[PDB]
Design an enzyme around this catalytic site. Structure first.
Site, PDB file in Angstrom:
ATOM      1  N   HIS A  41       0.820  -1.259   0.007  1.00  0.00           N
ATOM      2  CA  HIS A  41       0.096  -0.068  -0.002  1.00  0.00           C
ATOM      3  C   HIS A  41       1.046   1.305   0.052  1.00  0.00           C
ATOM      4  CE1 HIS A  41       0.105  -0.172   4.647  1.00  0.00           C
ATOM      5  NE2 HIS A  41       0.226   0.987   4.426  1.00  0.00           N
ATOM      6  N   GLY A 143       3.051   5.802   9.717  1.00  0.00           N
ATOM      7  CA  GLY A 143       4.662   5.859   8.895  1.00  0.00           C
ATOM      8  C   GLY A 143       5.189   4.751   9.565  1.00  0.00           C
ATOM      9  N   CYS A 145       4.230   1.639   9.041  1.00  0.00           N
ATOM     10  CA  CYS A 145       4.229   0.497   8.055  1.00  0.00           C
ATOM     11  C   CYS A 145       5.411   0.024   7.516  1.00  0.00           C
ATOM     12  CB  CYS A 145       3.268   0.651   7.264  1.00  0.00           C
ATOM     13  SG  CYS A 145       1.628   0.852   7.927  1.00  0.00           S
TER      14      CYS A 145
END
Lengths: 306, 306
Positions: A41, A143, A145
């Site tokens: 993503h 942030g 991820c």
């Protein structure tokens, strides 16, 4: 002596963390050999996340739409592919800090360390367990991820988790490093149910053995019990049922303390039925289930790594 | 979201740990530039520890009596010197991994990460607090001596603790990196009294603000209190008194959450007198005091390091 929730030393992992930027979105990636791994993503905007068609979104991206930065080094992207829910970005430079590593899919109830990162830089390390319902209760901000979970075996880093999202309930979900989610989750911003979560019984027992080794003995009782009798009680308190495989894994702790596994189970059954009544065990007022049998042996025998 | 007891990433410290053997005794040392720092009791046998005269013992030791080793690199000891309770073993090779670093002496109630080592090899990392009585509740086995505690100031490693001994009571004592003990302890095997330990009140308040930031609000109440009325109850429960300096430190958390410091204290007053009655805060059934106000801000704002 003493007993702490201890993480693995993070040095080998820190040298693999990079920053991946695609358009407006920036998150962490993992750079091993000449491939960078990150959550797919990264190619989504905030609006895209409600209902993303990843294949259509990816087709609108070229190798030069990906900015990969290892500190003050930009890496050049030479190919890209989607593997399940991860992107693999082939880069022109092989990571000289690549450790000996494996990719592993862990089972619920196993533990691992998380190196929480922001913008490709490390913030902190902590130990947690994969819950029976395939979530983890982490500490993650926007942030984070692409932050990874790992174990270390002598000289070898076993990567087992990449962080992908926070559920509306505040718990965390992610994939193995082949991009397959743990649990029934998908990478889109929508309400998603986690299973009922249960307590990891084999881990609680390991921790009671740790307590005995460290001098906490008050819960040791006269009684005993059977495996079926105990499992009948454990299910009433949403504890995982215990199997013979669990009894086998606890053998070494039984040998070291001289307390048979089923005797330790009868102590646990009484703690479940009457509680702790204001006493503590290893400093805690709750029964702890984030230590595996191998974690207890490691910490009580002083195992080290390369 | 979420909140975990997070350690600093350990990578910069792992490359500084060496093994130091002298006679039959083996412990960890810290290799910065061309000097290895280690507990001076590395020169003692187990019998010497009952009553060591370190100056007389050190006289009978020469440079070749010290085997220093870093993986499979042998270090040659050029000089030696004793600074308070640490031995400085100066070597011919300067550590090419030497990070930007500082030696600091911390205050009780401050937190740091410990990199637990055996034979110069890192085993795990965990976060702890210096207790008000200058002990730490760590996790340390034989041969962990010389393991160090540290903080990371952006690009700089601040070394603040080196482990020297386990007291008969199972708690741990050590020095700063200039060799001065924390607390009233000496490096000899004899019974030593630690003071009464108290709970670090400013840290408990910081963790209550963490709980609010993360959605636990049940303990917030109607009341308020003065700094005297609170300190009067706090002393009843062996809590450290709160000063205006502590109130000032908590200002940013007050501002972020809209809950005045004194109002939080009124909430804490109530928890102490009536307990928690079987419900939890941030997953814990006891009041937690190993997070400083700065730890909470770091973890709730995602600070990273070099």
């Amino acid at each position: 002596s003493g007993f702490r929730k201890m993480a693995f030393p993070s040095g080998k992992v820190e040298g693999c963390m990079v920053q991946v930027t695609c358009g407006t979105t920036t998150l962490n990636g993992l750079w091993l050999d000449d491939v960078v791994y990150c959550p797919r993503h990264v190619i989504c905007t905030s609006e895209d996340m409600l209902n993303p068609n990843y294949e259509d979104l990816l087709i609108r991206k070229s190798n030069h739409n990906f900015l990969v930065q290892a500190g003050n080094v930009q890496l050049r992207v030479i190919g890209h592919s989607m593997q399940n829910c991860v992107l693999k970005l082939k880069v022109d430079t092989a990571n000289p800090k690549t450790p000996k590593y494996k990719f592993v899919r862990i089972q619920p109830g196993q533990t691992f360390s998380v190196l929480a990162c922001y913008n490709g830089s490390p913030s902190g390390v902590y130990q947690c367990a994969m819950r029976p319902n395939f979530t983890i209760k982490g500490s993650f901000l926007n942030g984070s991820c692409g932050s990874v979970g790992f174990n270390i075996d002598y000289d070898c880093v076993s990567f087992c988790y990449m962080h992908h999202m926070e559920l509306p309930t505040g718990v965390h979900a992610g994939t193995d490093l082949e991009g397959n989610f743990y649990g029934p989750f998908v990478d889109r911003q929508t309400a998603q149910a986690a299973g009922t979560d249960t307590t990891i019984t084999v881990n609680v027992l390991a921790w009671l053995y740790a307590a005995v080794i460290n001098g906490d003995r008050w819960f040791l009782n006269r009684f005993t019990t059977t495996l079926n009798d105990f499992n009948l009680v454990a299910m009433k308190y949403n504890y995982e049922p215990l199997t013979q495989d669990h009894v086998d894994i606890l053998g070494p702790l039984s040998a070291q303390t001289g307390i048979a596994v089923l005797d330790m189970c009868a102590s646990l059954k009484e703690l479940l039925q009457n509680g702790m009544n204001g006493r503590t065990i290893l400093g805690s007022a709750l029964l702890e289930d984030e230590f595996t049998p191998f974690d207890v042996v490691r910490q009580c025998s002083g195992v080290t790594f390369q």
